[PDB]
Amino acid sequence: DGSFKRKASTFRRFIEKGGEFEPEKGRYHLYVAYSSPWATRTLIVRKIKGLEEIVGVTIVSPLFSAHGWPFGDVSPFPGAEADPFYNAQYVRDLYLRADPKYEGRFTVPVLWDKKTETVVNNESSEIIRIFNTAFNEFLPADKAAIHLYPEALKSEIDEINEWVYDTVNNGVYKAGFATTQQAYEAAVIPLFESLDRLEKILTGKDYLVGDQLTEADVRLFVTIIRFDPAYVGHFKCNLRTIRDGYPAIHLWLRKLYWNNSAFSETCKFDHIKASYYAQKNVNPTLVVPLGPIPNILPLH
């Protein structure tokens, strides 16, 4: 074999009036790692939707261990944080509190319910969609109206998401975790084919769909912002770089980062690089490269 096969997510519940998980302020909490593109999706949207005082956040240590994601008191790292609520030591401890028999993966992000002490949802694609509407009664009308998956654009969003997810978001991982030459090449080639395609899409455009920010942008962004800083080297995704091989992706990427604080404030390059280059099975020296300089170039 040699190819990476991502395991789907198992906690797949929603936050709905009159449902199992009623919308409430101060009840739900996100556990995340800044290094995770998946978890960062939820940080971005939480800020886009003005949810910072409605949904809590805890930043786990980026130093993924044999026990999984440690909390910040266990593996200190600047900006990492201790678990506020259960004296958990590793994210696994949250899952096994929700269900001591759980045998999925102990992934971030976790959208947690502090009332019943369980995982509402650990699928980042669903969490950000929960955020479009579930907490709207707690928001001003104009912030409530924000929606990154609007009905008029949904079919175009879904169409781009499908291959972006398969060949780019997961593609970097299929390339980087490959353990045979053949599996690596079978992942890296479609990755860059999809980047070539995105480049044409973003030529002369500020957003992927409808000339406005959508979740398609958020989902692509979290991969591309990590690309030159970590994927190119650590994961060998190196046919070309964003900054010198893809000027339309590069301009789209820099406008989002420099002009929308939801994208820069949730972007911790030290967390990102520390995480990937701590992966012993790929980088046994554990050295963290000093470049690229800069992590992201200015918007000029």
Next chain:
Amino acid sequence: TFRRFIEKGGEFEPEKGRYHLYVAYSSPWATRTLIVRKIKGLEEIVGVTIVSPLFSAHGWPFGDVSPFPGAEADPFYNAQYVRDLYLRADPKYEGRFTVPVLWDKKTETVVNNESSEIIRIFNTAFNEFLPADKAAIHLYPEALKSEIDEINEWVYDTVNNGVYKAGFATTQQAYEAAVIPLFESLDRLEKILTGKDYLVGDQLTEADVRLFVTIIRFDPAYVGHFKCNLRTIRDGYPAIHLWLRKLYWNNSAFSETCKFDHIKASYYAQKNVNPTLVVPLGPIPNILPLHHH
């Protein structure tokens, strides 16, 4: 302790078909001697055997031991590894079994295994066998020697060797202490080569050859494998990049001796650094065309 020369009346008389280079295409050190062999028109005067780029626990294997396209078997002694040659010259040799080897087939010994000396041998030792345009070439001429020495000193320590100091560092502190002066030296070179074709004296010299063998491997291997990645040549250093592309594309000595598959295969086969042993498909291309901007 193999630091001998080829001189008329010396221990090793200049002769056609007598001296042989054992090299790996991946080695910058060995590739210096391939470049100068082509520069001086010595291809049919001094032979070459290409060892496998797949460095092993026994060192450099020959192409029949570890096959790779273009890697050859040893034509003279059925050697399996380069060490076998050294130990033929001296069964007690306890140095490193490095390429390049400048070998004398007559007495079966190592003449010289210092690349910086081999290429200087090549400037004159075989001139009687050369046409006049090739005999006249000298890459370490007296009028430029002091400047060539000056540049060579820091290029050798911080650039030629520096990629290795960074890449084989095992502590963050050691890696940083090597990669920073490396890029400081590239910054310096960038200044030297702005508006210039050559490092020293508006003519090709060994200074160019000794730098080229590192810079040509930079984007294809040192950036990723050795984490020499503050910036790239092609995106970070336009004056170096132009000088590199001019030498590669305008001078067959530099391109025909440059086998990117050997280069990448050797470095990414280093399991201590790259345990998956996977070889990246990029960067594409290995070197950009001369008229690229």
